Paper text:
CRISPR–Cas adaptive immune systems capture DNA fragments from invading mobile genetic elements and integrate them into the host genome to provide a template for RNA-guided immunity. Here we reconstitute CRISPR sequence capture, processing and integration by a naturally occurring Megasphaera NM10-related Cas2 and DEDDh fusion protein (Cas2/DEDDh) in complex with Cas1 (Cas1–Cas2/DEDDh). The natural Cas1–Cas2/exonuclease fusion (trimmer-integrase) catalyses coordinated DNA capture, trimming and integration. The Megasphaera Cas1–Cas2 retains the canonical heterohexameric architecture, with two Cas1 dimers (denoted Cas1 and Cas1′, a or b subunit) bridged by a central Cas2 dimer.
Aiming to visualize DEDDh trimming and conformational changes in Cas1, we used cryo-EM to characterize Cas1–Cas2/DEDDh in complex with a DNA half-site analogue containing phosphorothioate linkages at the PAM positions. Isolation and refinement of particle clusters representing maxima of the reaction coordinate gave linear and bent reconstructions at resolutions of 4.1 Å and 3.9 Å, respectively. The DEDDh domain was visible only in the linear conformation. In the linear structure, a Cas1b′ C-terminal loop (Leu279 to Ser293) rich in charged residues is positioned near to the major groove adjacent to the second integration target site. The corresponding density is absent in the 3.1 Å half-site and 2.9 Å prespacer-bound structures, indicating that this loop participates in engagement with the CRISPR repeat on the PAM side. A C-terminal cap, which follows the C-terminal loop, protects the PAM and adjacent nucleotides from trimming by DEDDh. Notably, the DEDDh domain was visible in the linear structure, but on the non-PAM side of the complex, where no overhang trimming occurs. The exonuclease sits in a cavity formed by the interface of the CRISPR repeat DNA, Cas1a/b′ and Cas2, where it appears to contact the repeat DNA backbone and the N terminus of Cas1b. These interactions may beneficially constrain bending of the second integration target site or prevent trans activity.
Author numbering:
A (entry chain F): 1 to 130, 182 to 282
B (entry chain E), C (entry chain B): 20 to 311
D (entry chain C): 2 to 311
E (entry chain D), F (entry chain A): 1 to 93
G (entry chain K): 126 to 289
Amino acid sequence: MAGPIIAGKSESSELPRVEDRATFIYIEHAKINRVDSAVTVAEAKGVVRIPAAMIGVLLLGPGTDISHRAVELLGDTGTALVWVGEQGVRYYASGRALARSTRFLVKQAELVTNERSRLRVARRMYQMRFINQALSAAHVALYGLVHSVVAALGLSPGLGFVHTGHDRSFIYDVADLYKAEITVPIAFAVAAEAEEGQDIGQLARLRTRDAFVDGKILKRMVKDLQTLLEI
Amino acid sequence: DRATFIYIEHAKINRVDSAVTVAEAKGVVRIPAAMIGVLLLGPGTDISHRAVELLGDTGTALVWVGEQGVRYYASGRALARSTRFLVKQAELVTNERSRLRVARRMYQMRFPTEDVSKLTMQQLRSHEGARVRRKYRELSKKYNVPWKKRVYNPDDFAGGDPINQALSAAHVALYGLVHSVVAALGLSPGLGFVHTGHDRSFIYDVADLYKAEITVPIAFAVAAEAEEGQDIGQLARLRTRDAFVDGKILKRMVKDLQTLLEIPEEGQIEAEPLSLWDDKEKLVPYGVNYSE
Amino acid sequence: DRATFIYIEHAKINRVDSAVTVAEAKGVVRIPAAMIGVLLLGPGTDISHRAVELLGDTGTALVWVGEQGVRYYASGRALARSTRFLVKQAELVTNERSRLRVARRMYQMRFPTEDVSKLTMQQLRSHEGARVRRKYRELSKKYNVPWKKRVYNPDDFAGGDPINQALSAAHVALYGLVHSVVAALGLSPGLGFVHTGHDRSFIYDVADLYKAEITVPIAFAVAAEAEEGQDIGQLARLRTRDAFVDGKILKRMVKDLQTLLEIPEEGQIEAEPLSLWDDKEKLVPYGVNYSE
Amino acid sequence: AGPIIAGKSESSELPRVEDRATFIYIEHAKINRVDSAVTVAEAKGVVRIPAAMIGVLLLGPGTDISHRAVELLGDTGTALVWVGEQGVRYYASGRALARSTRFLVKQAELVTNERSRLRVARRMYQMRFPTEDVSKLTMQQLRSHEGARVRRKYRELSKKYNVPWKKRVYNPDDFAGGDPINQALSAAHVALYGLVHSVVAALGLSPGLGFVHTGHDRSFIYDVADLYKAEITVPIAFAVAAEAEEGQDIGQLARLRTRDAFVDGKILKRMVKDLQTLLEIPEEGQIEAEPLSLWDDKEKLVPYGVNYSE
Amino acid sequence: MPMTVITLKNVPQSLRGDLTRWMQEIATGVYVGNFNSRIREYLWRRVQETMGAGEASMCFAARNELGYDFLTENASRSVIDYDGLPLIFIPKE
Amino acid sequence: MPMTVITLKNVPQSLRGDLTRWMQEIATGVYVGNFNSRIREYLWRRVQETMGAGEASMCFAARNELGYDFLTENASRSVIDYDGLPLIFIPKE
Amino acid sequence: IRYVVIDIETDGKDAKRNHILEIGAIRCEDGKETHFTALISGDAVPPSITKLTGITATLLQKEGQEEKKVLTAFREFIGDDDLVGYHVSFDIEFLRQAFKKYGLGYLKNKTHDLLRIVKKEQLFQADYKLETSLQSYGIHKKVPHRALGDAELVKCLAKKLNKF
DNA sequence: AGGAATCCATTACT
DNA sequence: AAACGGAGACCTGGTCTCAATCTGCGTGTTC
DNA sequence: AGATTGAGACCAGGTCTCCGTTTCATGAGTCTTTCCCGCACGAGCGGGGGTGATCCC
DNA sequence: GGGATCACCCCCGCTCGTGCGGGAAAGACAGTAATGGATTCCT
């Protein structure tokens, strides 16, 4: 009568699509824990219960600490973890996957080993192509979300096209494809529209968040990769 | 050439100046990260953003695992930001001739005696099925284990003979550490050779190098002594956890994969685990100091 | 042509076989349904569906009213399902020839000592404005209540001098009774002759014939004996209820309406304020049984 | 604005008439206002009705409502209709929700002029059957022809569904009938009556001032109810009767199929628009910050609250 | 995106935290969420079994002309239709 | 049409029964309905001037990727702005 | 104290995309036997339920009956007391929604569920099974998946549990 | 000669 | 070391019954 | 008589630390093909609202 | 000319259609296992 599958964890089907989830969250000076099967970010004033399912990448800044079971719980959702620090990003993290079909990866493999195939993607790369702490915050937000979607669909960050030779080579090829488009005009606006006594970390990330949702850049992540991979 | 796979359990980690600080109740550790290549984390451990930062800039590998790798949870950047291994791993799957050679080597790694060059994927898949069926059959009566059949239920594993969960638990146990190592090594599990079209396609084509050697002997072992009214799965998991503590199995995957990926012995990078409370004597010359 | 404006309070009303039975606090009344032409349902009164079906057939007018009809909440059908008064009302309001005729007729009723029918209504508000100002002053002299200028605020009831609050509170008590009779008899509240543009335009116009006679002097009287702090809003309501207990004002206006509408003498239907317990000897000739 | 007191609210808070549900049915239960909540005291428990999302709250046989309960319903403009056997038995309604009365004044001035009455009577029949030209005939045969179309429509629908028709036409005034076709159609029609009863009060239209039907206090409903009875409820009612089986409460089944027609038919948007067409109200964004005014034939409308003596 | 809300009480603390991965928690045992209709049952199916003893109910965007529909299981607040209309039934003790 | 969610802790019973005329009660002290932007805000004006010493919070659909914005007055579970994303802040011991 | 043990099984889960297959119930009160069952004809059966229990168009035509009459009889004999069963709230939700399609009327019963009270005495894990609960209370008989067998099974379960 | 053990033929299952 | 789970611990916001008091929430000649 | 406020008693249930106990809940010796289910997308369209012309004063 | 009457878009909510990327579900792929008949041996 009941006919019930085992529960207490989550199958990727129960997770919303990589598009439905939000762009990113930023955390500072917090101790992340997993209480009552819930990921929590603990601040001095109090704690907050992040909805990991509805968020793509969860950035972490200086002076924050994360428990092991928290990383396990985030991996179930598959949300990516990015340790953001001073002067650019420092280290990356990821779960295992969100889609069980390796078609994009297999096609990604085909387009990376064949040198002529690399030239095709590189030529295809060019068509849709055409203060430091403020610009850095825009980069890492861009880096985190594009890493999450790449890791969500199983694409290999190691296999890049232009940026190559490092474990996150593909991310440095897909992230900069949009850096000069969205972040740069937003970053310039932050510098021009600036005032003393305002939280630059709060304000800069707030505006970049609006630009991403307004520009439907998250919508473009899946489609641009899919059309570039002929899938 | 030298890679260290340290496994910390039941402790926190920070730094003081440039070395990680294990916060176990037994003592205080200050292992420098210069010699650290891969850092495995077990259940009930903490790691701070300020500690992680040096790990990223020194090109180490942060990998969250279960108890000494019984299950894999998450990983990070591979060794020293080096993709010399995945790039070679990339060009093998795309080329069928390379895929024939790699798949053939996989079978001959399992059975060096049998001739493999004339065989193809279907031959390898068929012959392996014939071999494992023999291996299942002959070893079943060796442990006085009545084996009716191998049936695995992906949804409801609870209903069945004790071997099934035990074999499944033993099977999934090995899947963990092999996934963590290959992620640490820097090969995505997507690129399978015999198995394909799955997230862990490369895992299911690599774990078979040890399924007949580790999983099945221990699966029937716990099944033979399995008693009524017990979580055979949990007992099998505990036994697999004890087997993994020895790093001799771990030394094989790092060695076998490098051989499997046609890496020259000059480019082959051997590795070994470094226990915190059991390798103190040899880590002292390396600059590791201990406080209680 | 007698209309029974029966008022009931603290009662549960149903039917036994063919007559309305009233289960009030201190007994049970069994008034026949034929007599009930217009029912005045006071606070805390309950109605049964069967009684509604019985009273729906007789054309009885059902109106939900406050204590002794102090405030009107909702209304049902007109009296005896008639609509002649509403139709005549519509004809009179539409044409100016009749619009002026009734307008003078009400304005004359407010000036018993002066006939200003021939003077244009432009100064009639000026003439009326002097009368109420005269009425305000002389009433203040009689009860020695200071009075400078009526100031109020619909959004600020509590603030201001008590007399304006008391005068405003008494006026609302007056609208309730007059709005009850017009809905029961079938007048449209929207079709106002002098006032226009609001759903109560007629109500303020018809009650304007009783501004200077009942509501204003009572408000001045009660405020004179009232001191600071007392809720004059309910105090004014309770005393206006006392002036409505007799029901003489009920008879006075019910005759004035069709008199204002130029209804012929044959069409002058009269409403008699029958009460279940205030007219014990008056109902028993008709054959009504009482229970205690 | 003024203070908010438990049990009262203004029109601005309440949503417009076009953003409200159809109706509720209640049977063998008591209505009461406990803890400033309109509630139904059924046999097993209680239920709180969000009256703001209620066009009209129908009352079947064996229901009771207290005086205080009516007051709560009257604030939000929900009409009260008692529908027992033999169709509806009585009507009830509260204050008009909308503060303007320009709809009401047009109705009175239109009904007096027979030329205006005739043109509207021709306008009202045009919506019923746009395929016909009726700009010539007068009232006495509108009842014949509108009636003939109704009688013929009833006959054809009955034959198609295979439900025998006694030829007795639906008469809300003392309806008669006990056969399963009777309460199937009677309950269906009174559902249409309830929504119409509230909206005329909601927009401030006099219920007793109608064109085609006159002589009783609810005339205007009958004239405008006919605008959709032959297009909505009659097709639904006969469908229920045809599929009706023995020993089943067809009133419930019939009542459900009405709302599906009501929602899909887009009636509220259509019906409110139709009253505009009948009244020929011009389209303009009237602020009406000054609702009430004093009539002035010489000079439009003078405001209120002014002593004109000085 | 359509809105859905889930309430909980008297349920194991694991569930009370598990849903926080998906749905925010305004107060004690109440949740809000904007999920696709496909995601709704998956969360509810977990709630169908991870519930344990206690009481729970869910509201969501619906095609009924009110705008929402009700789901209750072993609740003193039974949901009963009123001609295709969701209402809360509170049986008396 | 954006969805509305209402919660109440330690509020006078008059408002608890009065607001049922707009929302249905999925759970005790928890109310929900489907209004527009204008009507919902006026219902805030009702609760804000009758709750007194109490606790109330609401959520309604908004132009944030989470899909809803939090509204709260005098509640234990405050709201904290995480770069525009409304998340429940719960003070601790 | 009167209750009705109801067990039903559908061809799926969706409200509009699935249909009731079998309906059988017993009132468990005062210990008098009025065992009842019913079946519904049909032509399409999903493979999963086909392998789990076994249902075919031939069976449905030779034994099953009309949906409307069976539902009418069900509403007729469930109008007196509450509906009780294992995981019964989910089944009652769909069944009452099915009465909406055929216009049976207003079902008025407490939506209380036997499974929820059974889960209470453990509260250990997040998943529970029928044969897990039955063996916990000395009910060795397994699932016959039929109306009367499951009816008597839940009757014994109610006798053993008695949380009400 | 008949059965029975053996072998082969063969379907059948892992 | 983390986290769950249970068994305690006592918490309080809600439900309920009980008299007591109430019939109700108020601009239209206010500038 | 129906309804609200308040005081009164109640207490189930949320919350807490303490204590014990785990380190988890369990597949894929074979992929391939052909399927089915989906809500996803665009895009078609009504439908009036707004806008724009003529039509009537 | 303004209001009154008859028609203009836009376009956007609404509806619907395919359809795509996912199911699940079978159906393929090889050597042995197992069964039975033919062969051979045995009474």
